Design a protein around this ligand. Structure first.
Ligand SMILES: [Zn+2]
Ligand SMILES: [Zn+2]
Lengths: 488, 67, 166, 129, 262, 313
């Protein structure tokens, strides 16, 4: 009921100007005009901003074209390349407000007649190089199949939210202080903003919604990774405690040592994210599949007590500001490694019992964690430190095939059983949060509880319940894995 | 904590956006709470970073290179 | 200056006050009136606090625990106030004396502007203040087809017309 | 679930006791706790072989594996699951049999620009695919 | 400019984060601890207040002079310019800009010397060895390097507006006024907008005198977390001022004062 | 106050004579200071009279630091020299001064219409920020020419401008004379010590009449006699007795129709009392601007400028 209750998202309703590439077929041209006219209405009915086309009026802002992909590329580059490169009757009554004190994002909608795609994406590669830097910094591409227009709405709401989330408004490059004097605090901010070490294209991320806060200041980074269908690439994804940030990375490991270098690059990527903030962090690392026997050895070296402490001191040397106040230095207070895999031994049937029927119209999730000691009554202790079951009624997305290889029978049952294990649990590096408790059972129930909470960010606004099970970071990583698999 | 209790049926003819409030829908069904605006957490951290000058991150192409 | 938040466009205590620290031009202030004595003796400015305005007292006792308890009570009460209390199910109701016109046939030119505005992009809230109702329920479909109104907005007018007839 | 593909097709077109005694000590003798399925290198000796698995799987003298590792069940879950090729080959064994099959399969699975890949990972970053 | 704070220069540039204040005060902290620096700031604010009171000045001009004083030291070292000369030149500039009239040369010199010899003799055993040319060059430098931001907003107008809105004007106004006067000792003027400080002072005043103000504060819509921080800062001020004596210590602290080189 | 701080400031500072060719080619002389044409090694560089900073310089700096408007002048940078202790300001160059237009014609109606509209909106914006100009002269109104923006009159030279948000002292206790006697309002000419914001309305009305007749309406007790002569004597504040029809004929003598839309606005702009004088916002609501052709952002509206460029002294 987003439109009925007239709610508004985060990011202040980013405005979008669009260009559409359509073939000169009357059947496909007429459908394009109506589809995007409907898209503008649903985009603006939700408080997502303005979805008007590029301000120049050329037949409803639709650009036409004309084996045939070559014809689809010549006009694609020759036209859109350069393209992106005193009476006031009503104004007499009101005086001008004054000078007082964010360009609209450009989205290029691509219709795909083919029932390869890279042939269509090759425009975007060619256009960006032949563009001025300021225009190129905010330009996005969206590909819609042609079968949507002709053949059979929840698609429009999904497309409107997807376009808004992909905008990623850039950080401003100027402060407009207007010092008009030799030097002052305004100039100090300006000359610090243009320092060479500051990265470019910050591209702040603003989603339609985030998790509500629940009662020092810190943050938790949730990172998960898995290898592709070939071991050439490591795919990783990350998210914040409240889903405020969401980024992904691809690391090339292709040698014809091979994995220790790959894991070092991953740890550098995770360190690059925490060090861009100004508050202490907590790191929880996840693995989509089953953890290896060498990855545990390699991770124990990187996530050692001596190491995590060493980078705290190295940070102090570089930055003066971190030296005075320790509450502002982006150090690491704890580390954790958790692996998720199916069980395939237990089954629960919701039909058997002992107002609402849970599996039909609702999603539920139960957890149970225990210390799982090896016997009753140096760097690495016992293999599973603590274990926990993850019973969820909501369906899980399409996982990689090797995920279900051990117990393929459990793939199809509606209530999924998943197993979460603890492997490292490095507590209180700098020297009460659950992640700093020496009881390994408390750590899992905190990590699994946040795994459930992050799974609710997957609720499609066009759908009643969450589209897929598990954390949001796991879900995007899985989407990236299949995208690489399909097109390559 | 925050569980689910009941389900309500409403005819699709009562759901229109002309009226400013929600006539068939009640805000108490969803446990709505109005909280005042604040600056985004991500935006603020960018501002506080200007006083730090940490190491420059990799160009995002350093990862996709032969080992 | 993106990190800092500005309350310029957010009124504080709206029923009795506007913007927090923005001062509009009041037409009945003390800097515009001209009494007989004001012109002769000039502007008469008296200290805001009688006695010693400069003097600041710190010898009076303060109880931080009581202040903290009162502030906690205020914030807890404030949270309760902003909770949007639940209301029972009820049919939507609209005031017919203002929200539309009873007879559409007053002028054909006004209809063309309104339906051209329906096919436009302005929000439905603005159109909610004035909607057309025809004598019969069949001609609205014919007029909608002429302007090619998107089906999402065309179904909204049907809901409003049914609301009037109910 | 077939009606939708079919109608989509349409829209597209128009518009002996000794033998069984030994077996019971190898096949059914393995009855281990299922909680320890998620296990790794043996902590006692820093190896992938330990406990009493030295008699079930084909020297070195491991001493008193007190923990719960079992290499018989380690090979079950660590053969096709997502693992580094370096880690997987240690579990199976390059010199022994079935090591060549894994290497041959991996190569047969395989048989462009850098900026194209960066564009690809940007499209999948959003919440919705 | 007045009536629009959110577009003025005092808010666009001269609102600083606490991290910047902590970072820029390290050079002054290499010789004195945080407590000594805080006590020195309080003492010099008191000196500015006394000097303004001697010249028969109003309260807005003294507040503007105090704000000018704090702004200069916030981003520059304390040993750059002698604060004993910072105070009179800031007072003179504040009087000049607030349309109160330019003080006389001998008048200002005599007032400064008399104040220093009657109520601050222990801190400064010697006389005030400066002339008007030094004051003129110092104020010229201050106007040069302060980005020419001479308009300073104050919580007094929001405080009067809020107390008039509430209705009570005799039981609450003196306490709120004296709390606003006392809060200038801290750095809150550089940290938060004036209306938040006014709201915090009003809350303290109404809580102290046992007035039911819960219903008034309930309806207003503003961030309710920063006000708690302002209350905490004010309470810390009042608690630390309880066991602090000027005469017993300021001699020792100014004995440790880093003086500028000739 | 040590040597290292001074040398660091000197290193950070930049010399005005080392960046601009301000020497020679003086373009304006007045009591406010000297205005020169300058360019980087075109802007108007203004040097203020008097060693050090005076009340006028302090008011100028403290007012144009925070005021921004298309119809209000805006300084780009300020220079402060310590060798001679004087102040230098750098405004954007304004080629044409309204005094030059008046002198050259001694005239499209849309031009004066738009010029009046722009000055009224500018003074309304100035009054919105709670400040009084206290000086409105035809020499203080400047017009851009043949640049990125055409027309776009700019109000400047507000050295006498003072904030009236809250007066700690009466406005006449520190400034007996606020504006030249050619445009002094009757209220302050009668010895008023607390005057409202309506004086600028009287000034803009007077200059609007001046442009209407292309001749100063008030020309020279020195001006009180002329004030009583132009529009009669009030027969319907201090020294009331110590002082010891005409408007229609005066406007007729200048070939201006008594019955028109401009005449009513001019008559209602000038009153003997402050209460009945119209404020800035109501001036725009007058249908005088709405009648016939409407006001233009570009005063010239494509016409060639016959007025020559400002000459050197
Ligand atoms: Zn740092
Ligand atoms: Zn073992």
């Amino acid at each position: 009921y987003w439109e009925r209750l007239m709610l508004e998202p985060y990011g202040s309703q980013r405005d979008i100007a669009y260009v559409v590439l359509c073939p000169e077929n009357e059947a496909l041209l007429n459908g394009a005009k109506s589809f995007f006219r409907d898209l503008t209405a649903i985009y603006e009915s939700c408080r997502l901003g303005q979805h008007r086309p590029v301000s120049r009026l050329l037949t409803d802002g639709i650009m036409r074209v004309g084996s045939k992909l070559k014809l689809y590329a010549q006009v694609c580059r020759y036209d859109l390349g350069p393209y992106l490169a005193t009476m006031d009757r009503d104004k007499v009554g009101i005086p001008t407000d004054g000078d007082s004190h964010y360009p609209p994002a450009i989205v290029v909608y691509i219709i795909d007649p083919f029932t390869w795609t890279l042939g269509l994406l090759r425009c975007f590669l060619e256009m960006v190089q032949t563009l001025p830097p300021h225009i190129k910094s905010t330009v996005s591409v969206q590909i819609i199949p042609c079968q949507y227009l002709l053949q059979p709405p929840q698609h429009l709401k999904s497309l409107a939210f997807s376009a808004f989330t992909q905008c990623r408004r850039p950080l401003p490059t100027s402060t407009n202080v207007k010092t008009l004097t030799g030097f002052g605090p305004g100039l100090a901010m300006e000359t610090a903003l243009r320092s060479p070490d500051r990265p470019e294209c910050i591209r702040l991320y603003a989603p339609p919604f985030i998790l509500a806060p629940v009662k020092q200041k810190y943050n938790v980074l949730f990172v998960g990774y898995c290898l592709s269908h070939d071991q050439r690439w490591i795919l990783a994804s990350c998210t914040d405690l409240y889903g405020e940030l969401l980024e992904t990375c691809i690391i090339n490991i292709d040698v014809p040592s091979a994995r220790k270098f790959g894991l070092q690059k991953l740890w550098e990527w995770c360190l690059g994210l925490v060090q861009m903030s100004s508050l202490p962090w907590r790191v929880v690392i996840g693995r989509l599949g089953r953890i290896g026997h060498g990855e545990l050895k390699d991770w124990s070296c990187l996530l050692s007590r001596r190491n995590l402490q060493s980078l705290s001191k190295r940070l102090k040397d570089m930055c003066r500001m971190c030296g005075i106040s320790a509450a502002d230095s982006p150090s690491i207070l704890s580390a954790c490694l958790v692996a998720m895999e199916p069980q395939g031994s237990f089954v629960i049937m919701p039909d058997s019992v002992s107002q609402l029927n849970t599996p039909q119209d609702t999603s539920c999730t139960h957890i149970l964690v225990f210390p799982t000691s090896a016997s009753v009554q140096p760097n690495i202790l016992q293999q599973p430190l603590a274990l926990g079951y993850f019973v969820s009624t909501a369906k899980a997305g399409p996982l990689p095939d090797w995920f279900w290889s051990a117990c393929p029978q459990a793939q199809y049952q509606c209530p999924l059983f998943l197993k979460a294990s603890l492997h490292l649990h490095v507590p209180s590096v700098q020297s009460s949060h659950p992640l700093d408790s020496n009881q390994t059972s408390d750590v899992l129930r905190f990590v699994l509880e946040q795994y459930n909470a992050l799974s609710w960010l997957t609720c499609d606004p066009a759908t009643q319940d969450r589209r897929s099970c598990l954390p949001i970071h796991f879900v995007v990583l899985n989407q990236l894995y299949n995208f690489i698999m399909n097109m390559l | 904590g925050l569980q689910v209790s009941t389900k309500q049926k409403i005819s699709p003819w009562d759901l229109f956006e002309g009226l400013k409030p929600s006539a068939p829908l009640s805000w108490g069904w969803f446990g709505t709470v109005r909280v005042d605006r604040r600056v985004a957490r991500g935006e603020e951290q960018q501002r506080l970073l200007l006083y730090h000058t940490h190491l420059r991150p990799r160009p995002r192409a350093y990862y996709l290179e032969p080992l | 200056a993106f990190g800092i938040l500005s309350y310029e466009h957010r009124p504080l205590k709206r029923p009795r006050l506007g913007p927090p620290d923005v001062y509009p031009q009041d037409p009945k202030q003390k800097e515009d009136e001209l009494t007989a004595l004001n012109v002769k003796q000039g502007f008469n400015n008296q200290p805001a606090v009688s006695g010693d305005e400069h003097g600041s007292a710190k010898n009076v006792s303060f109880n931080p625990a009581k202040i903290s308890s009162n502030f906690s009570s205020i914030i807890a009460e404030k949270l309760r106030c902003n909770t949007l209390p639940d209301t029972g199910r009820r049919k939507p109701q609209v005031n017919q004396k203002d929200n539309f016109w009873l007879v559409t046939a007053r002028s054909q030119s006004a209809i063309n502007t309104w339906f051209t505005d329906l096919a436009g992009t302005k929000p439905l809230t603005q159109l909610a203040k004035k909607v057309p109702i025809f004598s019969k329920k069949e001609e609205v479909f014919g007029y909608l087809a002429k302007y090619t109104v998107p089906v999402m907005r065309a179904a909204w007018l049907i809901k409003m017309t049914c609301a009037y007839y109910a | 679930q077939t009606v939708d593909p079919q109608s989509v097709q349409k829209w597209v077109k128009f518009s002996s006791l000794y033998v069984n005694l030994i077996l019971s000590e190898s096949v059914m003798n393995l009855f281990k706790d299922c909680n320890f399925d998620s296990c790794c290198i043996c902590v006692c000796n820093m190896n992938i072989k330990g406990a009493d698995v030295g008699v079930y799987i084909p020297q070195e003298a491991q001493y008193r594996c007190t923990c719960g590792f079992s290499a018989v069940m380690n090979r079950k879950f660590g053969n096709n699951s997502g693992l580094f090729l370096e880690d997987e080959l240690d579990i199976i064994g390059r010199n022994t049999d079935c090591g060549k099959e894994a290497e041959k399969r991996f190569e047969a699975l395989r048989a462009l620009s850098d900026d194209l890949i960066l564009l690809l990972q940007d499209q999948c970053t959003n919440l919705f695919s | 400019m007045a009536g629009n704070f959110w577009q003025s220069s005092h808010y666009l540039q001269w609102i600083l984060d606490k991290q910047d204040l902590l970072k820029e005060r390290q050079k002054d902290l290499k010789f004195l601890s945080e407590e000594e620096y805080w006590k020195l700031q309080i003492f010099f604010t008191n000196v500015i207040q006394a000097l303004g009171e001697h010249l028969k000045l109003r309260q807005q001009v003294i507040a503007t002079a105090t704000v000018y004083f704090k702004r200069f030291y916030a981003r520059y070292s304390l040993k750059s310019i002698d604060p004993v000369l910072m105070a009179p030149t800031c007072v003179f500039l504040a009087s000049k800009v607030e349309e109160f009239g330019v003080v006389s040369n001998t008048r200002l010199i005599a007032a400064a010397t008399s104040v220093l010899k009657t109520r601050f003799s222990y801190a400064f055993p010697k006389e005030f060895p400066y002339r008007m040319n030094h004051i003129l060059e110092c104020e010229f430098y201050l106007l040069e390097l302060m980005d020419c931001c001479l308009i300073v907003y104050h919580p007094y107008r929001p405080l009067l507006q809020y107390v008039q809105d509430m209705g009570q004007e005799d039981m609450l106004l003196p306490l709120a006024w004296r709390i606003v006067n006392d809060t200038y000792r801290t750095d809150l003027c550089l940290l938060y907008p004036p209306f938040m400080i006014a709201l915090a002072c009003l809350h303290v005043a109404c809580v102290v005198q046992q007035k039911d103000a819960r219903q008034w504060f309930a309806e207003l819509s503003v961030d309710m977390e920063k006000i708690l921080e302002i209350i905490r800062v004010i309470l810390k001020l009042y608690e630390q001022w309880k066991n602090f004596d000027e005469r017993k210590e300021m001699a020792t602290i100014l004995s440790k004062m880093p003086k500028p080189k000739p | 106050m040590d040597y290292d701080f001074k040398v660091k400031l000197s290193s950070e500072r930049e010399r005005v004579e080392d960046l601009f060719e301000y020497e020679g080619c003086k373009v304006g002389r007045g009591t406010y200071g000297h205005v020169y044409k300058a360019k980087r090694k075109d802007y108007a560089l203004k040097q203020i009279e008097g060693t050090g900073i005076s009340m006028s310089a302090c008011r100028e700096i403290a007012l144009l630091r925070e005021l921004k408007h298309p119809n209000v002048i805006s300084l780009q940078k300020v220079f402060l020299s310590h060798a001679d202790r004087k102040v230098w300001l750098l405004f954007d160059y304004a080629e044409h001064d309204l005094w030059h237009i008046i002198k050259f014609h001694r005239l499209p109606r849309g031009m004066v219409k738009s010029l009046l509209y722009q000055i009224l909106d500018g003074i309304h914006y100035l009054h919105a920020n709670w400040v009084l100009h206290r000086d409105l002269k035809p020499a203080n109104i400047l017009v851009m020419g043949e640049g990125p923006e055409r027309g776009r009159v700019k109000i400047a030279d507000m050295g006498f401008a003072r904030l009236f948000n809250s007066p700690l002292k009466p406005l006449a206790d520190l400034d007996p004379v606020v504006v030249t006697f050619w445009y002094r309002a009757p209220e302050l000419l009668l010895g008023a010590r607390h005057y409202t914001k309506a004086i600028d309305i009287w000034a803009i009305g007077c200059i609007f009449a001046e442009l209407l007749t292309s001749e100063p309406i008030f020309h020279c007790h020195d001006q009180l006699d002329r004030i009583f002569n132009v529009m009669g004597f009030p027969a319907d504040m201090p020294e009331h007795s110590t002082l010891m029809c005409s408007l229609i004929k005066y406007m007729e003598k200048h070939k201006v129709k008594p019955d028109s839309k401009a005449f009513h606005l001019l008559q209602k702009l000038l009153t003997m009392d402050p209460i009945k004088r119209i404020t800035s916002e109501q001036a725009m609501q007058d249908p005088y601007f709405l009648e016939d052709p409407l006001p233009t952002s570009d005063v010239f509206a494509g016409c060639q400028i016959p007025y020559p460029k400002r000459e050197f002294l």
